[PDB]
Amino acid sequence: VNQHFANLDDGAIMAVPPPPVEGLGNSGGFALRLQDRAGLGRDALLAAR
């Protein structure tokens, strides 16, 4: 599917195998939340992103 819809002209299509354990996330791998413990602002947070 990813090879097929790699040249899709309207948006993005991504196929991800489901996470091994239900309820521990929406996909397998790593989950990281990039916080702003100081209040740098939305633009600064996107910059860090």
Partner: peptide, 27 residues
């Protein structure tokens, strides 16, 4: 109203997957 001239080849697809200056294939 401005910034376009007749005959300009504008891309109307895959705008989410193109960066400035990247090479693309017209259809």
């Amino acid at each position: 109203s401005e910034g376009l001239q007749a005959g300009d080849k504008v891309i109307t697809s895959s705008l989410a997957a193109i960066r400035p200056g990247a090479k693309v294939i017209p259809r």
